[PDB]
Write a protein that binds this ligand. Structure first.
Ligand SMILES: CCCCCCCO[C@H]1CO[C@H](CO)[C@@H](O)[C@H](O)[C@@H]1O
Length: 158
């Protein structure tokens, strides 16, 4: 089991960490969602589906910088929604193919009422997402850590 990003940055068998740079809607009004769809940027696969089934959770998701201070968050994992920053490990998604499958994570971030002006700074860390991989074969329990950075400023109109 291993993962890679849309630009080819990979985390190999056994886990590790990688940076993911995301383009963000540049203007987001109070009452609207900023959507960060990581399923278009993080992809994973099973290296031995003949014999092994892999299990993958979002173990936790943390918010940083402007996202922590200026937004109210929800994470959708494989079709179900949870608080973000997270309060529990998600259900498992099965990975059972050698063909890449997106990691089905999307953040929905809506401005808090105090938000205004440059709410996320270009280049800043906005989230850390921990993908936890186990299987039905051995005792493997690996973390794939995704550090999410903003490619651009996000302005909340005042
Ligand atoms: C012939 C026996 C092979 C032994 C395979 C033991 C280690 O397996 C690697 C290869 O990927 C499998 C399937 O994706 C993962 O479940 C593991 O966590 C780990 O990434």
């Amino acid at each position: 089991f291993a993962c890679k990003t849309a630009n080819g940055t990979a985390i190999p068998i056994g886990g590790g960490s990688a940076n993911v740079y995301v383009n963000l809607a540049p203007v987001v009004n109070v009452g609207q969602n900023l959507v960060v769809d990581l399923s278009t940027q993080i992809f994973c696969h099973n290296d031995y589906p003949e014999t092994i089934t892999d299990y993958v959770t979002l173990q936790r998701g943390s918010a940083y910088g402007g996202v922590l201070s200026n937004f109210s968050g929800t994470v959708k994992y494989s079709g179900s929604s949870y608080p973000f920053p997270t309060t529990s490990e998600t259900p498992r998604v099965v990975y059972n193919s050698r063909t890449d499958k997106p990691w089905p994570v999307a953040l929905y971030l809506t401005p808090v009422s105090s938000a205004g002006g440059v709410a996320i700074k270009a280049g800043s860390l906005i989230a850390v997402l921990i993908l936890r991989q186990t299987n039905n074969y051995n005792s493997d329990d690996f973390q794939f850590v995704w550090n999410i950075y903003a490619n651009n400023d996000v302005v909340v109109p005042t």
